[PDB]
């Protein structure tokens, strides 16, 4: 079974560029992180810093997460981000994602020892 | 009991300014929506469009939401937000709440007839 720290650094963790150069990218990485085997996940959000800039994140802003929970961090600068989310086109097993590209704060849930994070709660 | 879409106004719309002016705008905010009744509710985005412009955005652009429900939209243009999170020092009855100004697109889930915004599932 992945670890969740592992499976947070598959689905969020896009270091290699610092920001998605084209309307593919997402159709690319959904693809390639695995994340469309039996449906295609509908939203998910990759970061283009370093793995240790987002680590960082969770000894940064603590706020509460989305489902109330208070092991969020939102990070205190702007990261470059890349939402990826199915358009009306999609269709597994022909998965289609509208990429778009943003620098905004990410908020994240943090867990474990070492403290890492888990989630990706949302953007800001 | 309150509707879907007038539920979406009182918790998401402030058209009365261009912005949050201050670190206090959601303390403020969060109370006089009535969203601090029984408890706090950990985070919430105000929308800093009119009604009309906001309402809109259930005609562009068609995406998946976060659930994987098909009836969310994204707006074309960023608009001007605040997101309110709770933060440490939050304990009910005396909520507190970091204030974030951005400008950013949203994405609504929209139902009914008319068919207009019932949820604000997240910003990009
Ligand atoms: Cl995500
Ligand atoms: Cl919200």
Redesign the interface.
Known sequence: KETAAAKFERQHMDSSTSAASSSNYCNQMMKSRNLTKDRCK??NTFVHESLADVQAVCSQ????????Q?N?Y?SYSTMSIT?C????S?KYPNCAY?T?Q?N??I?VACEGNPYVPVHFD???
């Open positions: 509908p939203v802003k603590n706020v509460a997460c989305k489902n109330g208070t969020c939102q939402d989310r199915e358009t009306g999609s509208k778009t943003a905004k704060h908020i949302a953007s800001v």
